[PDB]
Amino acid sequence: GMKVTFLGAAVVLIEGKKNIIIDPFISGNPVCPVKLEGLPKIDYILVTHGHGDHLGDAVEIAKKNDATVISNYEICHYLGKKGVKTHAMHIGGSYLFDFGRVKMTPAVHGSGILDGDSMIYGGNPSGFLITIEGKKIYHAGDTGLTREMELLAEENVDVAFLPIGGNFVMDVEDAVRAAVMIKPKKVVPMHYGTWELIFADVELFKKKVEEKGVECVILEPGESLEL
Amino acid sequence: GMKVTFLGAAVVLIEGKKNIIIDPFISGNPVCPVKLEGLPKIDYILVTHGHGDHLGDAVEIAKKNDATVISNYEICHYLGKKGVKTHAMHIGGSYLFDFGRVKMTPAVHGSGILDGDSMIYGGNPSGFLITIEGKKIYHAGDTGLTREMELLAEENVDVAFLPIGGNFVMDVEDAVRAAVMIKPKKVVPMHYGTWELIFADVELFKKKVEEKGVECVILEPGESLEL
Amino acid sequence: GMKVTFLGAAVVLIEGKKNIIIDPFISGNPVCPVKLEGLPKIDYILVTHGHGDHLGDAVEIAKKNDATVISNYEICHYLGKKGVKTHAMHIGGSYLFDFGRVKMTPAVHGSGILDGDSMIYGGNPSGFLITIEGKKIYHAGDTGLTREMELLAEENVDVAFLPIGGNFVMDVEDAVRAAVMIKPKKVVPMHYGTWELIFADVELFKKKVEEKGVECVILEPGESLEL
Ligand code: NI
Ligand code: NI
Ligand code: NI
């Protein structure tokens, strides 16, 4: 019975046999309810793409916990030069870890790593399909709407984390279209405005996505759900 | 009223409440009939990807007109260090501007920025779906045929600008397939071979696309249409 | 007549009226049974993406043979500064060469070029659809499962080279799904171990993909087929 906690932006913590965290943007994230010290022991870190507000505090968390970062080849190379342990993958690749299976999914987004004022190439953006104890979590990462999401329909995803922020990522309308393509058991909106207050827009997502027959669990940063 | 002018390569000028230009490759472009001075006042510049013949004169046009560049995060970061004002987006993201709505669409291509003799990462390539006064223009940018184009069918696009040059982008055969996926009211071919040695190709496209029930409006560089 | 030889990793040699090699990872490749000296005269070199185990010995082979490298714009720019002849293309673009037609196909993968310990942007990853004397060969490059593969069904591919290694690329299950999307007459697994074992993966692929009516030819590094 694992515990899945949303911590603002696109940060998702998964506590089970091991502890996994996705896109750990904690320090400098005004919507995140915890500090780095408030996180438990971290075994694995999943990074969807290179942008600063997803790559986040991965280096500091990896070193302090002796955790392995799971990401694409280019991101793992960049992190390797910082003395971070990594398990490289790429888009559409899967691997069976001790805790369960992780698969990188396609996404439509940039993956530039900002280092100083230089833009370093961090591969292509992704999502993650994670299979733990027969339960499937889909974290879309930063992405626009893409027909590749229809590949996840046969997976029967238990929970789908989709961005609804707009501008940099799907808005409410497209996120509803993604939710219908994927058809998960539940959908959690995230990255809703990249803002502290979104109540109007996130409720509009819940209303519209449930009209299409997909249950929406709104999790405020800090809140959890069980699987 | 709204005037849309094709200026060769992938250059598209849209004149209405505000003036916006897409992929402004003007100086250096031997098929572009106007110089930089022949352009009106520009409010916004849209860049689909980092390649020189699309990024073009964005820096100079922006500085002279105090215009804002709309492109992906990585391209806007590059332009920001040149002292250019930007509004960053990414693939599948939309935003409502004063003149209308802009949405970045997926493309299958590259997006390298050539700065001197170094290849800087300019994110992933895109197109643009612009909504102005209930009228929709689709500019595909440089792209190959992709199933993501089928997402635009429900938009009921009025004018679609598709490249047909081949080698770097779609050819005539594939561009006809894209038109049928998108089902726009009108389709304008662009980015065709330079030096005007390809009037046989554009006519073949017009013939082939209209056999599939899509009106084709051929525009020589300098010509326009209304919306 | 045509002799198509698989040389381990994703190395494919095509011998006809001209000699073409794809992703020439020879010298550092432990599974490749030949050395550079063991190759015949090479006329063209095709590179799917920038990763070292595919870009391989392209520079050295091109200079010795005075061969031309066909790849995306960013990869050809990188090779152009090494004094290598190139024909740049991009995703979805095709060109008719003397030996036949080459077309770049979409892929879901990174294309980072490692130069020293610096990651250079090498465009987006691709595959190649090659038409020689009315026969079609699809080399998927490194890629996950993508809905773009459905576009190749109408091509009626004679031989498809798909990766089945997992982790960095599609595993056996996903590779079967790709074969059903593409519907080639024959399919050849590659990039599997590439270590001799696991061999049971390759046998499982053969069994499963032939249940879907697609002939599977298992080529050991060194083995060939006529086309
Ligand atoms: Ni992002
Ligand atoms: Ni281009
Ligand atoms: Ni690779």
Side-chain angles (χ1 to χ4, degrees):
Chain A
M2 78 205 76
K3 182 167 170 279
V4 185
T5 306
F6 177 60
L7 300 169
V11 184
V12 171
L13 178 66
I14 300 163
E15 305 184 61
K17 181 175 169 288
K18 297 283 169 170
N19 286 349
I20 299 94
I21 188 170
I22 309 173
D23 289 0
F25 176 44
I26 312 297
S27 309
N29 185 359
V31 180
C32 189
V34 307
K35 301 186 196 177
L36 285 165
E37 284 61 40
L39 297 172
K41 172 67 200 315
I42 302 301
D43 293 299
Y44 295 95
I45 301 166
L46 277 58
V47 176
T48 57
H49 63 293
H51 297 170
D53 63 324
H54 294 260
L55 183 56
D57 309 299
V59 173
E60 193 179 351
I61 296 165
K63 287 178 162 171
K64 291 177 174 184
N65 295 252
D66 193 41
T68 304
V69 182
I70 298 166
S71 199
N72 73 42
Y73 167 69
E74 289 83 2
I75 292 165
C76 287
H77 180 263
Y78 173 84
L79 290 177
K81 297 203 303 184
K82 313 285 203 195
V84 177
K85 293 188 174 181
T86 63
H87 180 105
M89 302 181 77
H90 233 124
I91 312 313
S94 60
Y95 191 84
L96 184 54
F97 297 87
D98 48 3
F99 65 86
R101 185 175 286 282
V102 178
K103 179 175 185 176
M104 297 198 101
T105 61
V108 284
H109 209 64
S111 193
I113 302 164
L114 188 60
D115 193 29
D117 68 333
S118 306
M119 190 63 72
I120 290 169
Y121 178 56
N124 273 309
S126 84
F128 290 107
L129 179 65
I130 309 176
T131 307
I132 298 169
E133 301 164 20
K135 298 298 185 69
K136 289 167 176 177
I137 300 169
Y138 174 56
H139 189 282
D142 277 347
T143 188
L145 183 66
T146 167
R147 298 211 74 196
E148 308 291 10
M149 290 161 170
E150 293 158 327
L151 297 171
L152 300 169
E154 72 172 55
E155 299 287 353
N156 200 11
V157 169
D158 289 280
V159 187
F161 289 87
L162 308 179
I164 68 172
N167 185 86
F168 282 123
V169 296
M170 306 173 101
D171 60 4
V172 172
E173 299 294 346
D174 285 344
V176 170
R177 293 166 76 190
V180 173
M181 280 183 196
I182 298 161
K183 183 56 178 162
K185 285 154 177 161
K186 296 176 181 164
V187 60
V188 176
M190 64 176 182
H191 223 248
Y192 328 82
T194 58
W195 294 331
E196 70 288 329
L197 190 67
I198 195 85
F199 204 74
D201 211 29
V202 69
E203 287 283 355
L204 184 65
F205 175 72
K206 180 188 172 66
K207 190 208 176 193
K208 288 184 161 175
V209 80
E210 287 187 350
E211 279 172 1
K212 300 291 191 181
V214 182
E215 191 191 337
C216 173
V217 176
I218 297 168
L219 296 179
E220 298 183 59
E223 299 193 318
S224 304
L225 57 76
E226 302 292 334
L227 290 174
Chain B
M2 181 162 56
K3 191 179 179 181
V4 188
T5 308
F6 174 61
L7 301 174
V11 185
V12 176
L13 181 64
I14 300 160
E15 292 174 304
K17 256 77 171 197
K18 300 288 185 167
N19 286 338
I20 68 181
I21 187 161
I22 305 164
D23 292 354
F25 175 45
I26 307 296
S27 58
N29 186 0
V31 297
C32 184
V34 310
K35 292 213 282 284
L36 280 170
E37 323 323 311
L39 296 177
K41 205 275 180 186
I42 301 297
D43 299 291
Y44 296 96
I45 302 162
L46 275 57
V47 180
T48 61
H49 60 292
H51 293 169
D53 62 324
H54 294 261
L55 186 59
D57 297 299
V59 172
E60 189 165 320
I61 295 168
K63 284 183 169 177
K64 290 195 303 188
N65 299 249
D66 195 42
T68 298
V69 181
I70 300 160
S71 194
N72 74 41
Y73 165 72
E74 288 83 2
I75 288 166
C76 288
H77 172 83
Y78 172 79
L79 295 172
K81 296 203 297 183
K82 307 292 196 189
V84 181
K85 300 204 299 191
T86 63
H87 180 100
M89 302 179 77
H90 235 305
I91 309 304
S94 52
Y95 188 85
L96 187 60
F97 295 86
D98 50 15
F99 66 86
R101 186 172 289 279
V102 178
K103 182 179 180 172
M104 284 198 134
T105 63
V108 298
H109 199 62
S111 188
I113 301 163
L114 193 53
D115 190 64
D117 206 21
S118 306
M119 192 64 67
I120 293 172
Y121 177 55
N124 276 315
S126 81
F128 286 109
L129 179 62
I130 299 95
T131 307
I132 294 170
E133 302 177 12
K135 300 293 187 175
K136 286 162 181 177
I137 296 168
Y138 175 53
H139 186 281
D142 280 347
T143 187
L145 182 63
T146 170
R147 301 208 74 193
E148 307 297 0
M149 287 163 177
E150 291 160 325
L151 299 173
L152 300 169
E154 72 167 45
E155 297 291 342
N156 298 134
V157 170
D158 297 297
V159 191
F161 289 84
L162 303 177
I164 68 168
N167 194 85
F168 292 109
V169 300
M170 315 173 88
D171 63 4
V172 168
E173 190 179 50
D174 279 349
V176 170
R177 292 166 74 192
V180 174
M181 283 179 182
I182 299 159
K183 299 176 177 59
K185 295 188 186 77
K186 294 176 161 66
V187 68
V188 177
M190 61 167 185
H191 199 268
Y192 40 64
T194 56
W195 308 308
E196 198 65 22
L197 67 99
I198 41 61
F199 204 77
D201 277 320
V202 299
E203 286 291 346
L204 185 58
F205 176 72
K206 176 172 175 71
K207 191 199 177 206
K208 292 289 186 185
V209 120
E210 289 183 337
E211 284 172 13
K212 305 289 184 177
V214 181
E215 195 199 327
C216 180
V217 180
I218 298 169
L219 296 180
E220 296 191 24
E223 299 191 344
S224 299
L225 49 75
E226 295 288 313
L227 288 172
Chain C
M2 268 195 298
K3 196 189 175 197
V4 184
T5 304
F6 175 60
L7 296 173
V11 184
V12 173
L13 175 63
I14 303 167
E15 284 177 295
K17 294 184 180 189
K18 297 286 185 173
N19 290 347
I20 296 93
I21 193 163
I22 306 169
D23 292 350
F25 175 43
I26 308 296
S27 69
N29 185 0
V31 168
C32 186
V34 305
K35 298 196 198 185
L36 287 171
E37 187 58 37
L39 295 173
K41 206 273 175 192
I42 304 296
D43 296 303
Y44 297 90
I45 301 161
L46 281 55
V47 179
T48 59
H49 59 296
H51 295 170
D53 58 316
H54 294 256
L55 179 49
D57 309 296
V59 174
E60 186 178 336
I61 294 165
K63 283 179 173 176
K64 291 197 197 307
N65 295 258
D66 191 36
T68 301
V69 183
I70 298 165
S71 191
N72 71 44
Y73 163 72
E74 290 81 358
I75 292 167
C76 288
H77 181 264
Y78 173 84
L79 295 169
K81 295 205 299 188
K82 306 280 185 174
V84 174
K85 289 186 189 172
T86 60
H87 185 104
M89 300 180 76
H90 234 119
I91 313 310
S94 57
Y95 188 86
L96 185 56
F97 296 88
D98 52 22
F99 66 88
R101 188 174 292 277
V102 178
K103 184 176 178 186
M104 280 201 141
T105 63
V108 290
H109 212 62
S111 194
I113 302 159
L114 188 51
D115 191 294
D117 207 20
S118 299
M119 194 63 64
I120 293 173
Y121 177 57
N124 273 309
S126 81
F128 290 107
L129 177 63
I130 312 185
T131 307
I132 305 176
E133 303 178 84
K135 302 293 191 170
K136 284 170 189 170
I137 299 167
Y138 174 54
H139 189 280
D142 280 347
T143 188
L145 183 63
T146 165
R147 298 213 76 195
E148 301 307 338
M149 288 163 169
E150 274 152 336
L151 300 172
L152 302 174
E154 70 163 50
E155 299 293 344
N156 298 305
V157 168
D158 294 293
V159 181
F161 289 85
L162 307 179
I164 66 171
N167 187 91
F168 284 119
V169 296
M170 323 159 59
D171 59 12
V172 172
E173 286 188 57
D174 277 4
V176 171
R177 290 167 75 188
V180 173
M181 287 171 65
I182 299 161
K183 285 172 172 186
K185 297 185 189 72
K186 291 161 145 60
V187 67
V188 175
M190 62 179 186
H191 206 267
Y192 34 97
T194 34
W195 207 293
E196 191 268 298
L197 300 177
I198 313 176
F199 189 76
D201 268 317
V202 183
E203 210 73 42
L204 186 59
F205 177 70
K206 186 194 176 66
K207 183 185 177 292
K208 289 188 162 194
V209 81
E210 287 186 336
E211 285 163 10
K212 305 293 180 180
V214 181
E215 192 190 349
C216 177
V217 180
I218 300 170
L219 298 182
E220 305 279 59
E223 295 182 2
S224 307
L225 55 77
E226 269 215 307
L227 189 59

